[PDB]
């Protein structure tokens, strides 16, 4: 439920969305990796921002477990997850961007 055991690091880009997959939180690291200003990110579709709209749909996130390599210069491993409330209802989505040269 509320506890997502998705693996995350201090240096990770993090993006969080609403139910429509529109970005509502993005940290400094994610902006850095994307090479984009917060103003061009907040409120835009996460999958558009990640250049995935051709490849991936929001519907797939829940039943998906696969992480993907993405060119953002930087090669990131992206892992998507759902944000789920107490009653099992999905409230939004998370992308975790791991720099491939991490650790």
**Contacts with Zn ion, residue ranges (CB under 5 A):** 9, 12, 98
In Å, what is the CA distance from 17 to each residue of 26, 43, 45, 75? 9, 8, 8, 22
Using Cβ positions, the residue closest to Zn ion within the complex turns out to be: 98
Closest approach, Cβ 102 to Zn ion, in A, equals 5
Q: How remote is the C-alpha of 30 from its chain's centroid?
A: 9
Closer to Zn ion at the Cβ: 61 or 98?
98
CA–CA dist 103, 99 (Å, integer): 9
Question: Least distance (Å) from Zn ion to the CB of residue 11?
Answer: 6
Q: Per the annotation, where are the binding residues for Zn(2+)?
A: 9, 12, 98, 102
Tell me how far apart the alpha carbons of residues 51 and 102 are, in angstroms, rounded to a whole number: 22
CB of 7 to Zn ion, least distance (A): 7
């Amino acid at each position: 439920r509320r506890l997502d055991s998705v693996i995350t690091h201090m240096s990770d880009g993090i993006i969080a969305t609403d139910r429509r997959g529109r970005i509502r939180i993005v940290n400094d690291m994610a902006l850095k990796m994307l090479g984009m200003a917060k103003e061009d990110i907040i409120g835009y579709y996460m999958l558009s921002v990640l250049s995935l709209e051709d490849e991936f749909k929001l519907e797939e996130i829940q039943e998906n477990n696969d992480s993907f390599l993405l060119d953002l210069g930087l090669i990131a491993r992206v892992n998507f997850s759902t944000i789920v409330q107490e009653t099992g209802f999905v409230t939004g989505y998370i992308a975790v961007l791991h720099d491939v040269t991490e650790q």
